[PDB]
Amino acid sequence: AVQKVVVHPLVLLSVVDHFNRIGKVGNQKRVVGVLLGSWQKKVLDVSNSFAVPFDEDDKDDSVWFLDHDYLENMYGMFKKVNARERIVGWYHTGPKLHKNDIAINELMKRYCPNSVLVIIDVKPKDLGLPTEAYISVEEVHDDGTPTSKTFEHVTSEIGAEEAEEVGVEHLLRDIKDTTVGTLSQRITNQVHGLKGLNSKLLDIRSYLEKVATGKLPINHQIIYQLQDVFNLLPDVSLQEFVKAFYLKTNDQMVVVYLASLIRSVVALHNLINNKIANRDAEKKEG
Amino acid sequence: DVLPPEADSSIMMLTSDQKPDVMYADIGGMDIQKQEVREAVELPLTHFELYKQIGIDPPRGVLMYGPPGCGKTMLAKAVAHHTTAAFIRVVGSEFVQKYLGEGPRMVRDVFRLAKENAPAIIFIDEIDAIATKRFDAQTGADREVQRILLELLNQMDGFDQNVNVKVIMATNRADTLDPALLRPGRLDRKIEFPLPDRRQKRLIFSTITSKMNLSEEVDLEDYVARPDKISGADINSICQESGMLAVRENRYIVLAKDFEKAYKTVIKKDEQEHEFYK
Amino acid sequence: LREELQLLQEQGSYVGEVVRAMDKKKVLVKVHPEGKFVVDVDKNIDINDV
Amino acid sequence: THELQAMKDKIKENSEKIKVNKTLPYLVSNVIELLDVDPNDSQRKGKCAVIKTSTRQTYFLPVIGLVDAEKLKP
Amino acid sequence: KLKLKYYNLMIQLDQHEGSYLSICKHYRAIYDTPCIQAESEKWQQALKSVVLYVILAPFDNEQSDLVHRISGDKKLEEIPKYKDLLKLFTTMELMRWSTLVEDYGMELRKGSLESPATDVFGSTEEGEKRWKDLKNRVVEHNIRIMAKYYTRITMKRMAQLLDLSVDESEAFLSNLVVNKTIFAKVDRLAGIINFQRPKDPNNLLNDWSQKLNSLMSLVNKTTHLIAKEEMIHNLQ
Amino acid sequence: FSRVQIEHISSLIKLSKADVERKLSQMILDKKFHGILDQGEGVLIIFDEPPVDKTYEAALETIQNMSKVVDSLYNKAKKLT
Amino acid sequence: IDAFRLINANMMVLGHEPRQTTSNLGHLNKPSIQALIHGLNRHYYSITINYRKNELEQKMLLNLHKKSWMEGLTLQDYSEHCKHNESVVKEMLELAKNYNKAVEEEDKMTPEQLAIKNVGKQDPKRHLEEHVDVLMTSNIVQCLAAMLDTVVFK
Amino acid sequence: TKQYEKSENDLKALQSVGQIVGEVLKQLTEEKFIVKATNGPRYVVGCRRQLDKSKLKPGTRVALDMTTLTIMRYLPREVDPLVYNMSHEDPGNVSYSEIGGLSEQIRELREVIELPLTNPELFQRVGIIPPKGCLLYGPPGTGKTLLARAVASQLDCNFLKVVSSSIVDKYIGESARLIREMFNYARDHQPCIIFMDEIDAIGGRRFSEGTSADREIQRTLMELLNQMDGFDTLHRVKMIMATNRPDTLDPALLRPGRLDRKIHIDLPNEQARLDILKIHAGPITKHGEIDYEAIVKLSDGFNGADLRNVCTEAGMFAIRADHDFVVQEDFMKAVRKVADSKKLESKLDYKPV
Ligand SMILES: Nc1ncnc2c1ncn2[C@@H]1O[C@H](COP(=O)(O)OP(=O)(O)O)[C@@H](O)[C@H]1O
């Protein structure tokens, strides 16, 4: 099926600028549009998209509709100008999908064999790479219930090709690039580490909160198996983990030995040559 | 930036480890013709220092001529056994192009691919195609490829001194070869085609039949005289012709009537009572 | 570098041979792969310099 | 069952684009023909063709486009 | 279809002296003739003769998917000897060699089809060659799993597990270690012998790349944790 | 097999233990055979730690870097006198 | 990109050289944009382009492409640097230490030659820095492996 | 209606531009490979991600992108002229027996060509090198072109005729390369056979050199030599050569190798002409009165076509009377008298060997 999707900055902005379109008039609900995907292989890619006016009542929180004439002739517009582009699904700005979002995909399954819905985020806050990806699939259940659709999460990544790189790479004008080797890896050690702390923290806060409030199910199903997967590896020594310690010490040997070698070479060349050209410039001019 | 340099472009060389190769030791009639190639190939390549000691500069001149009898191209296949270097099959007319500039894209590269991949050797088979004297500007490209022949005449002297080349040459007709092609420091050594003779005959008699089935019936000392009065030849193929006459049968060892049949098929004639009164 | 790397594409560059100069300040020069041109000063090097 | 006239309209509109993009014959050319398909190393399908020009050039193209291998050998 | 019957003539040549591997795919080529048949005894004896030569051929990667191609057919499982032959191959573990003699000693009395006993035990010298070959195949089947599980072992426990003398253990360990299928360590005087393990750089590939290969699942922990979490929370 | 008894490895090679110990130790003398024997309990063990490469790089640098400062002795002691 | 606007040919009566407040004009002309392009400066003229914010979207789309050099999720890619993490990253350290042996065996030939030619040929060969960055990956070695004490224990 | 939209969706694939042909020359790195356009500019580009350079190799016909010029697809072998030289077909086979004479011309060429193909062991049994070609000449008598044409569809196997005309190629007569371009598939489709009529006008002497159009000739000869002068083994191709005269070819061709054997035709004997009339008298039916030796004894010293055509012309001259069947009476007159006019221009037909 669909493993991972490539979300370019162009489609994300194409939702967010429409969040300015209906956002200046407001008010509630979300920005929904039709997603134009490009499938070269099992890995999915996204290039363009277009948004359609959408309203959803709360009464009746399950009522939703889109304009098919807009989806039809504009697809005829975008397929005309670009024959490689076709609709792989739809999208919305969330932030969290209400249970009614399933039937939208079930309606457009006539257009595409598998429609992947992309939740997006117009205002960056947390925790990381924005948006989200959900693919329409029927997993049934291990409990043998009548088949129901719980959308499986698709990992989303940001990328570009050529011209879409040109625009944004000039538009940054913000932080140093990269710089490779010094600030890069250590700031990533802060972000990936600390955002990994509050991720599982708030996620384990939901683990206990769902047991405290929100039952049923809730708990079951995956709770006992997933939590035991957390209890798979504690994981400490003795024994072989002690061997990995001084083996890792034996690994840092070579690299730091080489470090002292570069120290001697850099100090030799630079210091000797600089003092030469220094003492020479002083004794000749003075 | 330039290339490494280089993987270059065309051919290139090998032709031994990737085949073909043919043993020269079968034909010994050319020994005196190999006497040049003996001293003019091995030591010139393997010693550049001895030429400082003797006080004489190694020539790039080598010639070949006469075909048929051919020798030549197959004799260039010989030294590919022992000396390991480039071997490039090239004529005058195969590197003719639709564009004039490809010549130095070959021959200027040919030099920079040779001396950089040196030790290397290059033989141009039948160089006589590019020696034609001509005017019209349609040949102005060829005039430029004989200016390329001049441009390769120009930049081949950069081989002086040391590493590396063996300039070996062959033509069946010496007519249109320019004086600057035979220029001092270009061709200083001329090999012609010596005609095979009683030694070479008995050598070309023995070398062919020592492989194919031979008989006690076969006395080739009569044929070092009777057919030898004219040919000459191409006897090597004539030596194979009587072998090709065994395919008329159903045969194992070729007969004597096939020996003469090879002589009666090739060739005639005297010619004439016009020569009887002389 | 980038400016000369910007300058040199939209035009290219070549090398000519002057076969004559003009009273109008122009110069008779060939584009050697192609037919000839006739082009003008070129105010640094004058006509009498070449 | 009434969509056959609608499909007739989309093949009239797209063949009108075949009237503007045939794509028009203008430059004279000559052909070189071959059949190919690509296994890897996933699996895909298609075919290719070769062409000459009036400018002497030659090109490697997915099979014509518009008329097909029906005719001819080049 | 006489050319297909000539295969039954050539199986005598391929099976005659030195090749137990050449009969692998060719006994499946002679198996195509009973497919057109319209035969009973020759068909059933072709099923057993083609399923019973697995022990003959040495262990190889081709031998696994080979017996997996013939495995699953509805006609094959009708024979309890196939149930024992499949029992030893799948999941391995251990079974007493005397019980293997019981199931493979009754095949002479079994039948119906006498053809497997004709190809295997029909010849005295060839039968004994396949007796020692069977001994080498079952002990190598034991070594295959045990070597992957070592670490270390003891010599006396190897003697009682393999049901053969310690010198026979060193003999079977000798001709298996010259096959370089498993690199062993064998010292009988101290009693501590061992098989495997890497024997890797190992300070980079093994310790580093594998540990942080588990850290792949550690950094992917919360990723698929919140996934399956939302999955069970949404549907009920 | 690295660790092996000397008597049964002489049974595989079919030779006396006297010239098995001396020939194998002669193979250790040639360095082509990595390992060592044990005469007390009659054991032979194979072990290796091949790479010296980092020490080669180190030595090549610093041993020549001696002559480097010797070369700087010429210039920096020339300004003195 | 580029910019173009057609000047009015009916203005040949009056002058062709506006505007006033030359700020964005004189700054737009530069580089002077070659010759063939400014050959269109007769009968045409360019126009200035500025990027208006819209800072929130510009900032998120800034981080969107920063996912390349920073990390994919700001978590994954350098947790993928925790996946490989010296793995198989020592193989490229073996090629880097082969660049140590290669480059520094000809780097020890440089200072002696400097004493022969007396001295700098300008130069230096550069043949500078380099494996300092390999030692910055060693900072990735020490840091991310020091995370194991936090990963393994509780 | 639906199939028309399918051709529309066919056209939805055709807006994609066709790539540029290329020949991979050599390589530098995994992102850099020496390649040249057919018009001469040399480039180094990157590949696509499916290929390995084992699927490319240096000196390989390939294709490149139209913008990035990246290596994408390819085909190893192509050319225009090859297969289009194949399609000439001769009735017979049985035309073998329809050439009349002559045995040692007929039978020997079978041993010269056929047996080399099927049984090269009989060459190595004795140890004799295989003849790689054959030569006809003339024209005493005639049939050099038909006996070839007949054997082509007779000997069967694989054979490719070489049309001798168009090689000159107008501008840039370098087309001697095309012989290698043809020999390359002759090394591919091997075994295959080649007939050549007219090697003499492409056998130019450069005896006393002049003007221009001779230079392109002699240069086109140098490759033909070198192609047979290899450096290569062409044995699986059989080169058959016939023309007006075996004289001007210069001695380079005249030696074995290039010219493997000497075969020719002379004036067919009246005994063999007795048979040449049967194959002429077979397709024509008349009244049953015939003496074959009559025309053979009356009409003397002719050729198969010369006899036949005039023999049919006699039937055509005799059918001028509008009567259908004709006895040899008119033919003992017409063929007699008509060929007498035809033997007026038999002058100067005797050419050197
Ligand atoms: N019996 C025959 N019937 C018809 N044509 C014949 C016969 N014998 C020979 N020929 C003709 O002779 C031709 C070859 O001779 P060629 O040398 O080309 O003719 P010419 O001698 O007129 O130059 C063959 O193509 C064939 O048509």
Ligand SMILES: Nc1ncnc2c1ncn2[C@@H]1O[C@H](COP(=O)(O)OP(=O)(O)O)[C@@H](O)[C@H]1O
């Ligand atoms: N050992 C030999 N000595 C002399 N001639 C030979 C020998 N072997 C082959 N030949 C003849 O030489 C011809 C090829 O010789 P080559 O030198 O390539 O021709 P050319 O001299 O015209 O370039 C063949 O036709 C063959 O008959």
